[PDB]
């Protein structure tokens, strides 16, 4: 230690950096272990002090040594393995830790190695002198210090039987392996133990007890033919519990042996109990690493499809571009109601004229159940399409995105995507790249759902009935067609059904906490025109073509904004109501939008550090709507300013033909009070509550659903 | 079947032994399949379990346990999804093979604080590394932990796993749990909770690691934002009534901005107290010699009624003004309740010194936060990290998590150590402490 | 990546080059030249003088003031052109007299330059930006002055 100290002293180190004790004692060393200024113990040696080192109330690791067994079978090189063990045990009188301590050989070759040992360097003993050496090594129930490191011949003088000078090691023949037999413990002397094995299988079993007797598994070596018997070595490694598994290799080292092997020491563990595997101690157990984290500002984005096409009769012209580009195979995903109408020939016929393989997929119903999307992928990879064209609004366009992923990545299971990609706010996990062998075209058929522009997909499992939302900016279609010639005859009872959905789609993205300057203008433009001729599109339908066209292009405008800023809580109880009362989406968020706005402008339990100081407020953002849409007096107060906005929302329903409360919307009192509690705390966890700055509570998400039932207006 | 005493535990453990012995032969192919099905059922069963995790516990609220259960169930299947923990790990030509093997039956103590968030985390890394666990929950929250373990079990059963792979005790007791730790067939202990049983876990003669919690101090100086640091700490302490481990326990502010915080706290959500009721609050959290179990996770107002003084309903947390930092004053120990300690600092330099004693008092350094301007004072943050001894350094960041905060941060739990004190730094427990790798040489 | 506040050349498929021997322009325009990723950062515009914030900002004002009135305006771009004018009428004056001392205004002005870029990527510029395109090339005056007077 002093040599290393003085070497370090004349290199820039402090003066008393390494210390040691002189004339040490057991009482003095005990005071060193219990000192409160020492926080690590490196213990080495036999189970005399390492056992006490663990029971010290301090972190400690021990570089121990377990009796390493050697297994030699009939197929091994007898002439070679006799000497590799022989030279590895005479190295420094067999004191180097983790050396050989026992040899296990089969009966087919036991006699062969007996006279070989006595011929080369061994001296066997079987008479009364056999039970002499065993009594020497253990004297008081522990290993004596009078024979550690001594040559073999002198220790025989202790027992009184002469042994010639040339002899290297002495070996006994013992069958019983236990505590009363002292020939199995670590001896640290040039002695070896020989064991009887009836076959190879019991040899490994007879080696398991030997390793377990040492407490800590350090090394294992067996000698065998490693070229024509490769299964035996593989079997040998899965049965022994040690840090090192050597074959045809001496345990410690030679005197052209392997050079890139760590020494026998520098291999410690941290427990004295059974089934403990040692590990190499290095400059990582003596070091502690700390991590700092800096509050990094978050960046927003504006992600959209590459191309969006919109005008009166824009489908065939936009579809043509696809023909000019290289595209031979394509499949169309569709619902049921429109196929029996003339709504499928306007896309297939223009495709057949140019000439392309198109197939019919007519089984998607109102809500995808993970069973028809799987069979759709089965049809997809059985056809190898180059372009995927979605049709329909909502259900058949959401399912087409999942079909695209499962077709482009068949090996990836759907349930793996249910925990990685479910909300567009994280950016640490990336979707596998898409668009390699296909691309998505999105076409809409109903006015008031911008699902052709958003990276959202909701999949229901028909087994139990649980939803698995998916959301990542890789499912967005590469092209969106917004045509209006296919909406001239929608029923007046449904043209406004989705029309009011877009109202809540845009009104909710404006007050979201993710709303930015990029998605604020589009979220406001959608609302501006929806009080101009959207009611006209209701009462006229076909008497006023242009209004229906103008409203249809606004659904995408509402959707082009909320695809970047997630919706709030209104679009959550809307999801929940529309899936258990079987009421259609668009109604659900229509009759509670007039009640969730008031629950967003008050004193109110609010989420903090966001939407309280970073964003200004939500009550005054609704105030901008009343003046942007032009329904406010020149001089008025914000509190009364929202009142006229809500009044406009109410009196539009007087001609919009929508029910006043949920009970009148076709639901029964009996199936509500027993299901409201089940219904409340699921809307709290449908990837909403990111937006709607107010943090919701279950206690306050039921009074909304109970207040809307009787038509009563919320007040505190 | 239910287990009453040690007589049936000494037969339950054999079934888990036999299942572990057969399960250790599984390969990486169908080990990940079992990993998939177990993670899904943990995430898909977050709300129901959280509702019934407070009915009998009586502490905490359901709203915040949903995110805690959900975040912990998906984070494990988020970074340990695909890493070789079975069969061959690497190959060095030099022929050097580095296969790995599991450890075996694992003991685990689930506290009443998080009866289910940490029950599904432990259960989800053992079946990844091909070992088994036995859970011993608190009698107050036994039924919640057992259901959480059984959900993962039944999810793994219909994926190729053996029948009796995870076990638990019903109507447990101190004497029964002692027999589980001294059993010679268990070779790992994962201890969590306060310094009540983790001390006995270390003194057990077996390898054990403890996911402890030290009282984490927050340092706010004069140059930090005063209208922002008040709220980040405020919301991080009301998260699940401040039972989330390694949460805030004491704030240290310089003399320049002391009174600038005192009125702000009472304005927003705090209620300061200095009269004889301060002594009552100190005595209301010590029933004898240590922390009581009657104010853990309870809202602030009710404990005031037990303490004697009336406090309005709207109030969020209550905070004392104590200068002495020692054992006699109980306001520095971990409280696991919506309470905070406010300290006096004459300058920034003594603030760090007054925080060293706070970290050392917790035994294990887990986290420590400092609030300061990180753009025009870059030397102070650099100085702050080289003085404390904690595993996590956070600046201008809430301790546990939010309700667009940082997403790639490991949970407050899954961070354990291997010693009680003596300047020990915690580390993230993962599928490497439960695995042993062996090396063959040709 | 944009290092100026007022020109929307990161999202629009427009590029003009001049001949070597002669001087007539060679304008190019094809939706295919639009970059597939645009980065709008504000820390890259923090110390440029109060003689480039006043001409870029006016260039952005001109870029959107006529895209709203262009014959190619559709219901998809008037929502963005009407926002940049609203955004620049309350942050450009605050980003000139005070400069970098008000970093919020600079970020708003820089971000709203790309919004006008979105507006004039689809609708096309009027005569105001064509005569200004030549009057700023013969008299060697910078782009931003020419459409300002």
Author numbering:
A (entry chain B): 150 to 404, 408 to 756, 758 to 869
B (entry chain A): 1 to 94, 96 to 404, 408 to 446
C (entry chain C): 595 to 743
Sentences from the paper on this structure:
Here we present structural convergent evolution on fusion enzymes of aldehyde dehydrogenases (ALDHs) and alcohol dehydrogenases (ADHs). We discover BdhE (bifunctional dehydrogenase E), an enzyme clade that emerged independently from the previously known AdhE family through distinct gene fusion events. Intriguingly, despite distinct quaternary structures and < 30% amino acid sequence identity, both enzymes forms resemble dimeric structure units by ALDH-ADH interactions via convergently elongated loop structures.
While most eukaryotes, including humans, possess separate genes encoding ALDH and ADH domains, some bacterial species are known to harbor AdhE, a previously known protein family consisting of both ALDH and ADH domains. The results revealed that BdhE formed a ring-shaped tetramer, while AdhE formed a helical polymer, even though they were purified in the same condition. Two different conformations (extended and compact) have been reported for AdhE, and the structure we solved resembled the compact conformation, consistent with previous reports that AdhE forms compact conformation without cofactors. Both the BdhE and AdhE dimers showed a bent shape whose bending angles were different. The slight structural difference likely contributes to the substantially distinct multimers, as the larger bending angle in AdhE compared to BdhE may prevent single-turn circle formation and instead promote the assembly of open-ended helical structures. We further found that the stabilization by forming tetramers of BdhE was observed for most parts of the structures, while that by forming hexamers of AdhE was observed only for ADH domains.
